[PDB]
Amino acid sequence: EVPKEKEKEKVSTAVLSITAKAKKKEKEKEKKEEEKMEVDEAEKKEEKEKKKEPEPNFQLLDNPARVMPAQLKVLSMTETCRYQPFKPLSIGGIIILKDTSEDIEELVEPVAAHGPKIEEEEQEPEPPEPFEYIDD
Amino acid sequence: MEEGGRDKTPVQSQQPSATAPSGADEKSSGKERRDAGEKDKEQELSEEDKQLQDELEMLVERLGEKDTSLYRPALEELRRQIRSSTTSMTSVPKPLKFLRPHYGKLKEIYENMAPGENKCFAADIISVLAMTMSGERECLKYRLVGSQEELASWGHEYVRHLAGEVAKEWQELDDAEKAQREPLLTLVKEIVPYNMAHNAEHEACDLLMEIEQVDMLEKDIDENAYSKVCLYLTSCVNYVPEPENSALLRCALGVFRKFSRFPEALRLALMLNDMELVEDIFTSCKDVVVQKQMAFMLGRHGVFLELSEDVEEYEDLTEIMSNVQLNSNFLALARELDIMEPKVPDDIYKTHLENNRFGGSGSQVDSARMNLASSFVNGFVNAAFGQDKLLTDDGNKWLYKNKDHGMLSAAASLGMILLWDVDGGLTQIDKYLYSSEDYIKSGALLACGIVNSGVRNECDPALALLSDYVLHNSNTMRLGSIFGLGLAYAGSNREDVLTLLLPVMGDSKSSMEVAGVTALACGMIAVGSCNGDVTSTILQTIMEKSETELKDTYARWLPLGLGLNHLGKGEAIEAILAALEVVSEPFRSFANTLVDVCAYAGSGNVLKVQQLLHICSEHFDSKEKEEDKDKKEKKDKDKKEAPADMGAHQGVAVLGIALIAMGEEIGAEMALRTFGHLLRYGEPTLRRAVPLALALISVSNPRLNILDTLSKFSHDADPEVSYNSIFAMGMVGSGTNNARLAAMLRQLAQYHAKDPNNLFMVRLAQGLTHLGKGTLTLCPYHSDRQLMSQVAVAGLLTVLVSFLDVRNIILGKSHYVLYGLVAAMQPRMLVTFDEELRPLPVSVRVGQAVDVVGQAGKPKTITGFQTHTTPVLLAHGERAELATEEFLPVTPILEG
Amino acid sequence: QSTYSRQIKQVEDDIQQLLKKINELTGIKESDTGLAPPALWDLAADKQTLQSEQPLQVARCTKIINADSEDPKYIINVKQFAKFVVDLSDQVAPTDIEEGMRVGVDRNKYQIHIPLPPKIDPTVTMMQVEEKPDVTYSDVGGCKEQIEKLREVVETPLLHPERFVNLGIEPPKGVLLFGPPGTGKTLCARAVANRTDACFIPVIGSELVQKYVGEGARMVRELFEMARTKKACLIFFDEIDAIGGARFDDGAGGDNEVQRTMLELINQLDGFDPRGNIKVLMATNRPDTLDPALMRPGRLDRKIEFSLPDLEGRTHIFKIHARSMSVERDIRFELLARLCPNSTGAEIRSVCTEAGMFAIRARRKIATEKDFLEAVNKVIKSYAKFSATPRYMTYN
């Protein structure tokens, strides 16, 4: 994470602790009939996030695979499911017939581009993007 | 050990009975709790009655035994049984008498544990019982004084039964005023002054006072017990907050003044700073006490005793108020008025001038800068007044020949030398006005105001001459009238004084450095009283700060003046405040913290907290640095809480200066200069050793200005044998020379360190306490945070007046002389229950008088035990007087 | 109870946390500052540091040469015993340089940044000396003519040199205090030194003499030289009985070490240079021991005997002692004085002391005449046998 963004959070944290502790410690109240204690010390700390794990996944080796039987669907041209190589069983799941793309070539499923017959059934639209030609 | 035993008739088995509840009693625990409820009342009376007799006998017997560690937990467990259903549930007539030894069970616990938390707790439980007993407590204390079988413990412990009263859970007037407080005070100086302070039982004591005096005389030492109650009240500021606290200080002042022993009363009045309090002191003491005693005379004397600042009688808010009080008080109009009037204290000063002589080496060396420096030195040798009169009277030599700033400054300082003259100082002033440049003339006006103060009570006063002067156009002549008016009066709440300040003070920045002093002077008028205010000072202060603060000396005076003016209570202030509030500055913010202190009419708990959330060691250029140094010193605070608490506070103040110095590179040089002024204000425990130690290091180190400030306080004792120390210090001063600029600072330092023989050093506290307060010393201090001095700067420093009147012996009842008194010497210190410590004489002879000096002569005491009398006024001579109180209208003490 | 318990535990606990601050702020290792006088002292030292003063190794100038490199050249020998040829700096001003005196040279580049102060060769002598303390005349026994005579000698010329020069007479140097002990020779020496207000150097005769032969010559030589350079010195040579003795040799060690100090004092005093700005006061109980050189004038101008006092004088020692005490003035000072004649100053103070011993046993705060009478009759009979005076007065 960017150094500048986190530097803001640390600075903020440090100012509240030092300023509050400065007044709190010096005040005199114990001797007084007010009794809020002559010393009161003031520390606040920050925390940083840790690695996220939403719903369990199965981890074996360094992981050239990592699966769970409970499925979610994700869009094409949006692999945000950042696959490990050699998982054929997770791409297309075990072959789709819930989608426009119906397999007529069975369990061939590379982790790269799989586009079987889109004419068998229609369960959803399919915008063409000329974007790859543009880049070209 | 033996179980029970307060169920067995012999008086011997009572002693194991006290230990016994640790195991438990055989019949005695069940009799009180279980059997009392379970079984019928009439039947129980048999069992109880046999137990009552023993329980009572046992109370004197327990006190007779000496354990407090075996005694204390055993009787404490038994206490729970009595509380259950023997407190007042048993029957109506039987419990009242049963509660009488019950009181005893608790008392040992109350006594052993002498903290304040145990005191409190112990009180809550005891007060309810008191109310139930309905006067069995007063009788109980009486038996104890007699001692049937007692012979030790009962002296600390019985006081605790009185301690129990304070809480007043259910006690109206069922024992709150008189319950033998007077024997209890007489024997025990410790525990009762605390009980006394809080309760306001102290009021009853006034009624008692004649009777109490008899015990005070030479049978017992009650005098010590009275002296103690003031120590606790000043300390009580920190204990319990100031708003809760102000009513308590006020309550003790009424009782102390009425009761004859004035020195404790003055300490509280001085702290309050109001108009009402001062008139009262004269009238109260007269009416309660039917005999004339010391009591009539005290009303005058208390004014004299009090040391605030400047001119004689000091505060002189009180002296201006006295003119018709003096009339009521009556021990002779003519006499009372002549002594009270500053003519008498002035008169003794004159007689002293002949023996005193001049012990330094004069100089009025004509022409150049040398002339201007020399004029300064004249005042400095005395550090006040002595036999300089001869030198000063010739106008021609010093004053006329002086050039530029030197004329104003020399002329300004001239009034401060000539104070302690009634006339013949004045003639010199009148002449100088006539001659030469505007400068001599301007400094002369201020000079007139000070001299004329030597006679007042509407006997030719300062106001009459100064009023005409106030109109003058020149900024120097204006400053002289207004500064002279705050110096002379040093407290005023007369209409005429306040109205004159009202349209002047139109200044807010001027070329002349001395013009800033006008603010201090307006604040000076406020002090010692409640608010009428003068609008002009208040308006100009905020404006000045934003406008200029570059001239550090100029800058210091204006916020200080603003706080001092606010001081006291009233609704006059409310109106001007709205006007002041509409403007808000960062600049105004510090001035405001000082005002909080001022407003309340003296604070010390509010002041305390504020000094933690401080303005100390803070600047942005010199924006917040205006009040920062003044605050750090916390001299006002040190003196305010007891003489005992002061010792510690003083060490901390020093430590604090050191702390400001570490923080700021600039602050280090200032922190050195600050020490002479701090020491000077404070009336420290570290008195002789410290300024001298610094002074030597400072020769070797650069900055001659350090020596010059250090020297004011370092002069210390005046020659008796102190000559050896002064001459050595002086030698170091002389030797050094390397420039004229350098030379001027040293030259002043040499002559200040020297003192003429049997004069006195500085004092700002009343001389039986370390509590005081001046406003006079803030001025030299402010202009000596600079590097070097100037001709201009030099003129402010020349004053150190708030010094003694030459009486430190027999103020007396038909004496009022310079002439000595019998004294005896003791190296002893056994007391801790005196206003600043005073030992008991063994009556062995030594050379007449206690030292006229501002230090020393403190263990050297009065003998008034071949006179068979007790001193009200404790012997010291720091400013103190040796006078004694008899029933007789006059002290029949011996002279020598 | 609760409130106090709490405050104790808390304050202490705060010192632990504070520990970083305790060391910097108060001292006791790692910054011992308060930065009002150290800010100044440090600042001046820094410029020195930066060039070539610190580390400054103590050395001393053996000789001034002009050989090898620059025209100013010096051979300094360090206190590790190696010589070095060094330069001279104007980089900071040399101020105290003299041949044979200690000088400071650097270990990085050996050149004289600053000379060490005048004749600090013995650091040992200088530390022990008091400088002019205040002794009150309420314990310097008696009024007496005996006290007054010393003052004319010691105090007047130092206090005022004005007079002596005007007439054209030479001013006092020498006084001999001789007489048996307990007559306050030390006691008076101190009192008048403060009265005059000139620098006080007391030195013990035993300290002058130390282990090796000619070590004793180093301390004395350098002490007399140090005295002359400063402004007004009085060297009070304290109590030399056998530490001052007449020249002889036994061939086992001899009087050699003793005479060494003695002889050193003679060589610089008379010398080919005369006594500088040094006044001398001698305390001896035995003039019988001393060398003929010391006894003749030029350091012993006038001999004054401060010995056992006269009959009137003993009464005056009682009166001065009573002022210090807080005992009765109804006790006749005279009665005590007649009851114990032939008593030194020390003995009259033991009478007061004794009087107090009887008094404490009885459990009185104040001494009585009864205790007093008893105390003198015990002193006249018993104390006489032990007393120092028969043997010391025979020598005197």
Swiss-Prot record, chain A:
The modification Phosphothreonine is found at residue 13. Residues 119-136 have a biased composition (Acidic residues). It comes from the Eukaryota. The modification Phosphoserine is found at residue 17. Residues 25-35, 42-55 have a biased composition (Basic and acidic residues). Residues 22-64, 113-136 are annotated as: Disordered. Belongs to the proteasome subunit S1 family. Component of the 26S proteasome, a multiprotein complex involved in the ATP-dependent degradation of ubiquitinated proteins. This complex plays a key role in the maintenance of protein homeostasis by removing misfolded or damaged proteins, which could impair cellular functions, and by removing proteins whose functions are no longer required. Therefore, the proteasome participates in numerous cellular processes, including cell cycle progression, apoptosis, or DNA damage repair. Component of the 19S proteasome regulatory particle complex. The 26S proteasome consists of a 20S core particle (CP) and two 19S regulatory subunits (RP). The regulatory particle is made of a lid composed of 9 subunits, a base containing 6 ATPases and few additional components including PSMD1. Interacts with ADRM1. Interacts with ZFAND1. This is 26S proteasome non-ATPase regulatory subunit 1. The gene is Psmd1. The chain holds residues 818 to 953 of 953 of the full protein.
UniProtKB/Swiss-Prot annotation, chain B:
The modification N6-acetyllysine is found at residue 551. The keyword Transmembrane helix does not apply. GO terms for molecular function: enzyme regulator activity. Residues 708-896 are annotated as: Required for interaction with UBLCP1. The modification Phosphoserine is found at residues 29, 147, 361, 363. Residues 1-51, 623-645 are annotated as: Disordered. This is 26S proteasome non-ATPase regulatory subunit 2. It comes from Rattus norvegicus (Rat). The lineage of its organism: Eukaryota, Metazoa, Chordata, Craniata, Vertebrata.
Curated annotation (Swiss-Prot), chain C:
Component of the 26S proteasome, a multiprotein complex involved in the ATP-dependent degradation of ubiquitinated proteins. This complex plays a key role in the maintenance of protein homeostasis by removing misfolded or damaged proteins, which could impair cellular functions, and by removing proteins whose functions are no longer required. Therefore, the proteasome participates in numerous cellular processes, including cell cycle progression, apoptosis, or DNA damage repair. This is 26S proteasome regulatory subunit 7. Component of the 19S proteasome regulatory particle complex. The 26S proteasome consists of a 20S core particle (CP) and two 19S regulatory subunits (RP). The regulatory particle is made of a lid composed of 9 subunits, a base containing 6 ATPases including PSMC2 and few additional components. Interacts with NDC80 and SQSTM1. Interacts with PAAF1. Interacts with TRIM5. Signal peptide: none annotated. Monoubiquitinated by RNF181. Phosphorylated. Dephosphorylated by UBLCP1 which impairs PSMC2 ATPase activity and disrupts 26S proteasome assembly. GO terms for molecular function: ATP binding; ATP hydrolysis activity; general transcription initiation factor binding; proteasome-activating activity; TBP-class protein binding. Gene3D superfamilies: 1.10.8.60, Nucleic acid-binding proteins, P-loop containing nucleotide triphosphate hydrolases. GO terms for biological process: proteasome-mediated ubiquitin-dependent protein catabolic process; ubiquitin-dependent protein catabolic process. InterPro entries: 26S_Proteasome_ATPase, AAA+_ATPase, AAA_lid_3, ATPase_AAA_core, ATPase_AAA_CS, NA-bd_OB-fold, P-loop_NTPase, PRS7-like_OB. ATP binds at residues 179-186. It holds the Pfam family AAA. It comes from Rattus norvegicus. The keyword rRNA-binding does not apply. GO terms for cellular component: P-body; proteasome accessory complex; proteasome complex; proteasome regulatory particle, base subcomplex.
